[PDB]
Amino acid sequence: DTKEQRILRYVQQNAKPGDPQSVLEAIDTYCTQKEWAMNVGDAKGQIMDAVIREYSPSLVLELGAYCGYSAVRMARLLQPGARLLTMEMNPDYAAITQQMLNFAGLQDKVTILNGASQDLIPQLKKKYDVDTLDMVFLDHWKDRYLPDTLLLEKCGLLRKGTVLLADNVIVPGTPDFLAYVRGSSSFECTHYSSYLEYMKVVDGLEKAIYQGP
Ligand SMILES: CNc1ncnc2c1ncn2[C@@H]1O[C@H]([C@@H]2C[C@H]2CNC(=O)c2cc(-c3ccc(F)cc3)cc(O)c2O)C[C@H]1O
Numbered sequence: 001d002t003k004e005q006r007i008l009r010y011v012q013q014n015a016k017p018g019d020p021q022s023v024l025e026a027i028d029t030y031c032t033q034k035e036w037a038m039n040v041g042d043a044k045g046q047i048m049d050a051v052i053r054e055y056s057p058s059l060v061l062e063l064g065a066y067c068g069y070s071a072v073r074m075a076r077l078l079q080p081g082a083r084l085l086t087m088e089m090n091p092d093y094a095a096i097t098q099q100m101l102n103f104a105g106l107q108d109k110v111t112i113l114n115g116a117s118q119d120l121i122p123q124l125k126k127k128y129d130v131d132t133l134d135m136v137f138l139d140h141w142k143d144r145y146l147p148d149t150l151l152l153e154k155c156g157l158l159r160k161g162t163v164l165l166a167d168n169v170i171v172p173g174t175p176d177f178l179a180y181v182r183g184s185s186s187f188e189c190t191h192y193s194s195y196l197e198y199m200k201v202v203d204g205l206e207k208a209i210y211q212g213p
């Protein structure tokens with residue numbers, strides 16, 4: 001089996017069905033004690049929680065699902081009726097993510113779309129009935145944060161106040177995205193210094209709030 005299958009099995013056998021907090025704890029224990037994996041983790045996760053609670057977004061887009069850790073983290077704090085869409089091009093990861101959300105009991109709040117962001121983002125309005133996004137969590141290939149930000153704006157998916165929250169702006173790093181948002185009058189940026197998941201290595205989140213054109 002794969003590392004991601006082992007993580008899902010561990011959750012199924014060590015967390016409580018329908019209890020998202022137990023699912024996060026199981027994943028964090030597994031990845032601390034057994035095998036590292038690229039989940040956002042508890043250190044950065046706590047900052048994500050604080051952001052979600054501040055904005056109470058009704059519609060969130062996530063780029064890159066992996067095993068569903070961040071999707072569980074965000075979805076568990078959404079208000080009744082609020083929704084998360086998460087895009088994941090790897091079909092095996094998309095399958096893990098669906099099963100993780102099912103186990104957590106969050107399936108009704110989240111739609112896991114199996115495809116590439118650059119193909120799916122242009123379909124959001126007409127196929128998925130999206131007007132604008134309240135929040136976007138970027139956690140996919142680091143060289144695609146900037147292109148996809150620019151594509152979201154082109155597609156009319158950003159509104160005044162849309163919150164972009166970007167993982168891994170230090171490690172592995174997203175230098176073009178950071179330079180761009182920090183230099184642009186269309187974004188108000190805040191940096192939240194933290195640590196790489198499960199490691200004593202500095203990382204950080206960037207919040208970039210869209211201000212319109
Ligand atoms: C471009 N559009 C895309 N659309 C949908 N899914 C996409 C998509 N680009 C891609 N996807 C999916 O996401 C998959 C890429 C690999 C993830 C993206 N994350 C990372 O690379 C990552 C890495 C580290 C890391 C690794 C090693 C170190 F020594 C230190 C840090 C930590 C993280 O927190 C990370 O998030 C591939 C694919 O499954």
Ligand SMILES: [Cl-]
Nearest residue numbers: 039040069070
């Ligand atoms: Cl994650």
Ligand SMILES: [Cl-]
Nearest residue numbers: 041042043198
């Ligand atoms: Cl952590």
Ligand SMILES: [Mg+2]
Nearest residue numbers: 040139167168
């Ligand atoms: Mg990440």
